[PDB]
């Protein structure tokens, strides 16, 4: 993970929908889960951690319990995709991902949530 990229700097999602934000990182030959770290956060609130091949939710903020998950199948393709269900107005803001795979990098992602109707 010398350089982490994001497909979008801004995501516009509808209220109540399911949101998937992504951070891409280089995977040359095949994914070694032993050395991979994936960390998602938003406004000092930890969303999810992925280390040693497992999700770590010890410091997960209570807002994202049962709502946030990491698409593990996408990790093999160099995609750290954060999936958040039942998006509410409080989910708009500034997100950040950290990927550590050999190297490490950070990327900022902005989320805007449209009004329900």
């Amino acid at each position, epitope marked *: 993970a010398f350089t982490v990229t994001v497909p979008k700097d801004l995501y516009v999602v509808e209220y109540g929908s399911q949101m998937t934000i992504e951070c891409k990182f280089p995977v040359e030959k095949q994914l070694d889960l032993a050395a991979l770290i994936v960390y998602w956060e938003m*406004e000092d609130k930890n969303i999810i951690q992925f280390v040693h091949g497992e999700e770590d939710l*010890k410091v997960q903020h209570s807002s994202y319990r049962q709502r946030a998950r990491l698409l593990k199948d996408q990790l093999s393709l160099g995609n750290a995709a954060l999936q958040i269900t039942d998006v509410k107005l409080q989910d708009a803001g500034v997100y*950040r991902c950290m990927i550590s795979y050999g190297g*490490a*990098d*950070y*990327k900022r992602i902005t989320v805007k949530v449209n009004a329900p109707y």
Partner: antibody
Amino acid sequence: DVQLVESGGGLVQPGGSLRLSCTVSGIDLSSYDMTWVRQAPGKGLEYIGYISYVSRTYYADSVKGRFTISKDTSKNTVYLQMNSLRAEDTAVYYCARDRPDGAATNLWGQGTLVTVSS
Amino acid sequence: DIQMTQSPSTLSASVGDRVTITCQSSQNVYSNNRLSWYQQKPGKAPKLLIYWTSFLASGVPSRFSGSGSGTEFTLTISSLQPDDFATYYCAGGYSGNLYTFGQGTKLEIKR
């Protein structure tokens, strides 16, 4: 490539004020935290404070009420404004990418020397 | 309020030896794993060796190894090389965006 450069160190009288600058190259200041660390002559590393990627600031207890950290993204610079300097503040001052426990704190500046003395 | 103690304060070894540095924290590090190790040589800025208790930074030789959880942590250097003689610092991250450094361990050349 990525570069860190401190500047602004020099001689200050006790009770004086001094502002240090950390000019970055190849670091997205909207995506990276930046930390200030000092080292007194012959002593160990001491965390001072850091400013997050969303411009929130945190300080060690030893500089609370005296040091303030700010960021100017349009100038690629992170600042350390030091007030009410004491002789104990004499140290080399480093700015480091990321936080002291961060995965990307492998890049440090060369440090700038601050001397507080009468 | 938060203190981190390194032991031993000084190490003496030869090239090819194995040494261990112990880092003890009064408070649990954040998520029980936010402990980093640094290497510093005189006149130079610190160098990041390990983060998240066991993850080597880019270019760090595999002979460096970290372990521990909570409040007790260990850095192990197997088969010392001449480049390894330096001063070593652990650093902890804590809830509420708090940080501290250990007092440092000096690894000198035994003769």
